[PDB]
Amino acid sequence: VPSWPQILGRLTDNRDLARGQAAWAMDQIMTGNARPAQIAAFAVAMTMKAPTADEVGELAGVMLSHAHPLPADTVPDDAVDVVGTGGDGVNTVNLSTMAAIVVAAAGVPVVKHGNRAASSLSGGADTLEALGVRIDLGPDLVARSLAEVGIGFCFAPRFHPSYRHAAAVRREIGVPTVFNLLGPLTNPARPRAGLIGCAFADLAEVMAGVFAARRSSVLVVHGDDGLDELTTTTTSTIWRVAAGSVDKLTFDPAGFGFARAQLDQLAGGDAQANAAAVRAVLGGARGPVRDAVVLNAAGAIVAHAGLSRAEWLPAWEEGLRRASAAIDTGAAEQLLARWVRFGRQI
């Protein structure tokens, strides 16, 4: 009964889909049964209609239902992700990746969902590769990385091979669509907490709704300068997800003594340049990049706390203390070194 003309017609009529229709569509896409034209029409039509949390949740659900999972009982109940949509139009250093290393060094289990560049000069995966970290590990070895090192990296194309038809279309049309939301929503380890960047201000709330439905503890963040991270150049909008509900907040780092930075102070380069930036921060270099890394690490720790009960300002103060200490003690630098060793000993 479901068909492309039905679903696409409903969307072009600016109507929300019926329950299960978005899922049907995504499943057709993920099983190689959709024509490129159908994939593109669907992505564009959903985007222009304004996707609902129900709809985006169905898309992400289908992706997760096809993904390679991690082995049973290898992901702690309190694992966290630090990942964004990307596509903010700014070539920054890899802030989520740097933050993730610091969070893990603070003792919070991290299973990060990641990928190579799409529109930037160096993606988190590119940069980790340049640092000597193995980005190509399957379920079993990601699980061992998490256990042994404190952090695992799930390379999206490795865990989502059936997404390859959609990815090709995303590339061909260029324009961001609802598909650009799915990465942060489809970590195959299914961590229940996260700091989740959204480049698209008008779609952050919908992302937050999806996390709320699965009762995650997440901060969905959009820098008011456009960054899909908590920014240091100005305020950030946060959609705070806890206990199945979303509430919208504005966050000002000046409240925690952060000086305002300029966006060009966070600029990145190629994989080697961004790798150097990771080494500089973990080595104790003070300055704007460190500040942005500590701020986002703290945010992820706050999300982790919310799995409990948790109070906002004490949570942030503790998160900032822990993030800063994880760098200052050398723990974060050492953790990266241990991560690199781990991959070379497989």
Ligand X SMILES: O=P(O)(O)O[C@H]1O[C@H](COP(=O)(O)OP(=O)(O)O)[C@@H](O)[C@H]1O
Out of 15, 19, 31, 36, which residue is the one contacting a copy of itself (CB under 8 A)?
A: 36
Angstrom CA distances, 145 to 70, 101, 259, 275, stand at 12, 13, 36, 20
167 binds a copy of itself (CB under 8 A): no
Residues with their C more than 2.5 Å from the N of the next written residue in the chain, i.e. before a break, are 308
Nearer to ligand X, 17 or 299 (CB): 299
Query: From residue 186 to residue 205, what is the string marking binding to ligand X with x (rule CB under 6 A)?
Result: -----------x--------
- Euclidean distance between CA atoms 119 and 107, whole angstroms: 32
Of the candidates 328, 264, 300, 337, which has an alpha carbon nearest to the alpha carbon of residue 93?
264
- Residue given tokens 């961590």 in the structure block: 191
> Does 203 interact with a copy of itself (rule: CB under 8 A)?
no
Q: Least CB distance from residue 292 to a copy of itself, whole Å?
A: 27
The answer to whether the beta carbons of residues 229 and 256 sit under 8 Å apart is no
Query: Can you tell me the distance from the alpha carbon of 259 to that of 48, in angstroms, rounded to the nearest whole number?
Result: 38
Smallest distance from the beta carbon of 94 to a copy of itself, in angstroms? 23
Q: How far is the CB of 177 from a copy of itself (least distance, A)?
A: 8
In the list 2, 69, 87, 269, the residue contacting ligand X (rule: CB under 6 A) is: 87
Q: Please give the Cα distance from 8 to 12 (Å, whole number).
A: 6
Q: With binding defined as CB under 8 A, does residue 31 bind a copy of itself? A: no
Cβ–Cβ under 8 Å, residues 113 and 186:
yes
Q: Which residue is nearest to Mg ion (CB)?
A: 96
Angle, alpha carbons 283-231-285 (nearest 5°): 15
CA distance 144 to 167: 28
Determine if 49 is a binding residue for a copy of itself (CB under 8 A): yes
Interface characters, 157-196, with Mg ion (x: CB under 5 A):
----------------------------------------
Q: Which has the closest alpha carbon to 194: 206, 203, 185?
A: 185
113 among the known binding-site residues? yes
> Could you say whether residue 95 binds ligand X (CB under 6 A)?
yes
39 binds, among Mg ion, a copy of itself, ligand X, none (CB under 5 to 8 A by kind): a copy of itself
Q: How far is the CB of 85 from ligand X (least distance, A)?
A: 6
Please report whether residue 175 would count as binding a copy of itself according to CB under 8 A: yes
253 near ligand X, judged by CB under 6 A: no
Q: Exposed (0-12), middle (13-18) or buried (19+): which is 221, by Cβ within 10 Å?
A: buried
Instruction: Tell me if 118 contacts ligand X by CB under 6 A.
Output: yes
Residues at the interface with a copy of itself (CB under 8 A): 3-5, 8-9, 11-12, 14, 35-41, 43-45, 47-49, 168-169, 172-177
